[PDB]
Design a protein around this ligand. Structure first.
Ligand SMILES: [Mg+2]
Lengths: 154, 168, 252
RNA sequence: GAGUACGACCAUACUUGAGUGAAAACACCAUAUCCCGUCCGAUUUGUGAAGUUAAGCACUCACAGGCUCAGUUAGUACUGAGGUCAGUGAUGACUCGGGAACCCUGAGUGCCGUACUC
RNA sequence: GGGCGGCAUAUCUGUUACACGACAACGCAGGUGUCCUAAGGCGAGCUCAGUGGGAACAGAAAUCUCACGUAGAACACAAGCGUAAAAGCUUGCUUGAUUAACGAUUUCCAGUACGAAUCGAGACUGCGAAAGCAAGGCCAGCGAUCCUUUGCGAAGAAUA
RNA sequence: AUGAUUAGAGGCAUUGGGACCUAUUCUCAAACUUUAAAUGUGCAAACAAACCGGCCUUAGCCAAC
């Protein structure tokens, strides 16, 4: 892009959303990051300090390092024929905790909800039947799809 | 109506706008200590205007904010030179007014042979008590639109305390 | 005429501040740094000594920041000092020290860490050099949050400071903004600070009010309406620190 | 049913203009001997408690501006795959899928947390 | 084509560039080899640009005062980001622009060096009541072997 | 909002030989944007792993455990 510095082509990318400006919030400071957790690097201008490079902005990986104001995070970057694991280190405002495994911890805890209702009790929520089966249709309203003459005059 | 809405004098502003670089101005800071009797503060210029002979950041004025008991005793001092007659356009719509004397020795100041003559400005600021809510560190808010002193409200205050001749 | 600043375009692109910034209650630039702790301290409890001095009340409370909202651990007020023998001051420097003592006694009894960590049973003005882990058993550590008050050398948010310090709580501080501290000599004076711990500076001015309003014919009206006297102001606090330090859970 | 202190989201909370406000509290307010800081006790600091809800704050009300949320615009614009499609071309339709935006219209106009209190 | 011209020869922001990243042309629009003992560090106080009402001489413009003012100002510089009890302005003390055990990393990439940068730990500190912030002024502003040259390896102990 | 860009409507005192203000309007933007696709792009989807209740250890953290 005629210059190959660190923040190049980051005009719209390191900007802030409309009426979403300002310094980071208190629930970002209090959000405690632990080693081994999936975080989600999103660079926060209005910090401008310890930002990731522009490549690591939609990305999400595993924390391997926690320092007093820093998070190391292992992020996969494909180079030529291989996907090597980049260990970047950012400030703590440039990471969000990742909800990537939210739908897996949900059906995991549903497998301790079930097996706590089968071995001891018997009460279960019923299994859901498919809407793709062949039922009967009771027509409560019928129309006629016919392409009237007055559909063209617009 | 309500005794909290008594229009008082908030401040009084004794502006001198010497214009010179500071030769005559150092006896213009002394002419105001024989007035209000607290330390004057200086004032430099914003830009450099060539026709006026003034450059940037050179001390070009002397002003003082005086409050309290001398805020009252320097309108009775200061409106003798007006004979209690100052116009209707001397009043602002924010509630305050002002007037400019032409020579200070017609107040009752003994004329020193070192300090010369000086004309001044006397811009008062009228307000009601409760103006603190616009000047606070914590819980700073605005004064509502019934409690501002108006132009028509500063008419009658000048005609019921000190004077009574606007003479439009 | 005059161009309107507040166009509909002004309102369409206006970004309002935080609610407690519009209201003028929070310095979020200091709120952020007070709440900030090391990320290696994985959510350890960090407590603020929130002191807020209104026109008629001193509010001292130990507060832990949460994402759902700050979690007040044992507040303490100055209007409940009449349960202890102080009917009169309640917004002076001598009731800042009592509210800080009554906070640091109710807080340690809340933890069970009282009868250890009591400290300075009779007060001086002298500096203590608080022992914290940044510097045996460690005292309970909270840091002092003045909010928006201007920290001047003699202010009453620093009377709650030595109230809490001489009550057994460990607040980190230097004695630079105590009243008996000299800027250019750089040496504390424990005489001048101890005098307004026990409200002596009220007593040389309650004396002038009862002496220059009896020869001449609203200041200290409810004290002159009372039977209260100078020389009975200073011992009124020393006895009232016994009522606090021995049983702090009492209130109105 | 409310206050105060700390608050989380940060306009459904803002802006303007009216209206109302039990208690208690906040708040204006009084003041300058000490602590302290100013051109100025204005702010600020201290020390107060005569006065008032005038103002702040709170709440309510606008064919209010804004904001928020659906709906419409509209299967429209645009676009992924296809053709020995059509058209001199510009470009357009069809086929298998995805599918907007402003204007406009309707709604309503903060919500949850801790400690202390009326 | 080569020559003249030029720099697309090291390098920075916007765009080309086709909503990750990467993408060419003597493609477009401008920068770079400097500058600063404060224009660095920090704390406190403050609010800017502009407009409107006002006040002797004093006008469109001198300075005082009030109101409104989401940044329309400023941040040495090209540009873009970002920023309002601040990152701007003023003031106060300061030297973290030092040292930093061969820690790890990012950008360019061959995942080499260089330049720039990030997250650390150690010494000694600065400002601050404190939490904190600070090892330059974010992000461009720079350079191998060989050779020259400077600094450090104070003296005083030690039957080794 | 910023950069362009036509035109009518009067606001009446805000002025000088359309300035100004308020609502609209015709028409646009590779280096403009409130909003925003289609196509893309990152991670997770149970066998060195997460899940559930004791123990040992640590000059890690916290006032303590
Ligand atoms: Mg040589």
């Amino acid at each position: 892009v005629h210059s190959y510095g660190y923040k190049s082509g980051t005009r719209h990318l390191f900007a802030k959303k409309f009426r979403k400006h300002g310094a980071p919030s208190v629930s970002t400071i209090l959000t405690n990051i632990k080693v081994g957790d999936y975080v989600d690097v999103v660079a926060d201008s209005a910090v401008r300090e310890g930002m990731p490079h522009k490549y690591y902005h939609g990305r999400t990986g595993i924390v391997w390092n926690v320092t007093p104001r820093g998070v190391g995070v292992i992020i996969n970057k494909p180079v030529r024929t291989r996907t090597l694991r980049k260990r970047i280190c950012v400030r703590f405002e440039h990471v969000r905790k990742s909800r990537c495994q939210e739908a897996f911890k949900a059906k995991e805890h549903q497998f301790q909800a079930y097996l706590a209702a089968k071995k001891a009790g018997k009460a279960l929520p019923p299994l859901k039947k498919s809407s793709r089966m062949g039922g009967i249709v009771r027509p409560k309203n019928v129309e006629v799809l016919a392409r009237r003459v007055a559909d063209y005059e617009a | 109506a309500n005794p909290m809405r008594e229009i008082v004098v908030k401040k009084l502003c004794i502006n001198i706008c010497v214009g010179e670089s500071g030769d005559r101005l150092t006896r213009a800071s002394k002419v105001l200590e024989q007035l209000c009797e607290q330390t004057p503060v200086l004032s430099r210029a914003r830009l450099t205007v060539r026709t006026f002979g003034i450059r940037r950041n050179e001390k070009i004025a002397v002003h003082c904010t005086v409050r309290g008991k001398k805020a009252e005793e320097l309108l009775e001092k200061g409106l003798k030179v007006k004979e209690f007659e100052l116009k209707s356009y001397n009043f602002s719509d924010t509630g305050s007014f002002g007037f400019g004397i032409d020579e200070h020795i017609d107040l009752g100041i003994k004329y020193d042979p070192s300090t010369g003559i000086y004309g001044m400005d006397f811009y008062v600021v009228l307000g009601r008590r409760g103006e603190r809510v616009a000047h606070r560190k914590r819980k700073c808010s605005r004064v509502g639109h019934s409690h501002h002193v108006t132009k028509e409200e500063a008419m009658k205050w000048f005609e019921k305390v000190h004077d009574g001749i606007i003479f439009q | 005429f005059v161009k309107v600043v507040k166009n509909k375009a002004y309102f369409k692109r206006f970004q309002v501040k935080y609610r407690r910034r519009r209201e003028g209650k929070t310095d979020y630039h200091a709120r952020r740094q007070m709440v900030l702790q090391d990320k290696t301290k994985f959510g350890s409890p960090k407590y603020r000594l929130v002191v807020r001095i209104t026109n008629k009340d001193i509010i001292a409370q130990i507060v832990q920041a949460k994402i759902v909202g700050d979690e007040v651990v044992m507040a303490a007020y100055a209007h409940e000092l009449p349960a202890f023998g102080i009917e009169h001051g309640l917004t002076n420097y001598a009731a800042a020290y009592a509210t800080g003592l009554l906070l640091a006694r109710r807080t340690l009894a809340k933890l069970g860490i009282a009868d250890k960590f009591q400290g300075a049973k009779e007060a001086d003005g002298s500096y203590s050099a608080v022992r914290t882990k940044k510097d045996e058993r460690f005292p309970f550590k909270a840091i002092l949050d003045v909010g928006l008050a201007r920290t001047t050398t003699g202010a009453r948010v620093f009377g709650v400071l030595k109230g809490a310090v001489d009550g057994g709580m460990a607040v980190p501080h230097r004695p630079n903004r105590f009243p008996g501290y000299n800027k250019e000599k750089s040496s504390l004076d424990a005489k001048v600070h101890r005098d307004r711990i026990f409200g002596k500076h009220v007593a040389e001015y309650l004396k002038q009010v009862k002496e220059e309003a009896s020869s001449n014919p609203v200041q200290f009206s409810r004290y002159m309406a009372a039977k209260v006297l100078p020389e009975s102001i200073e011992g009124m606090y020393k006895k009232a620190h016994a009522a606090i330090r021995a049983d702090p859970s009492k209130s109105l």
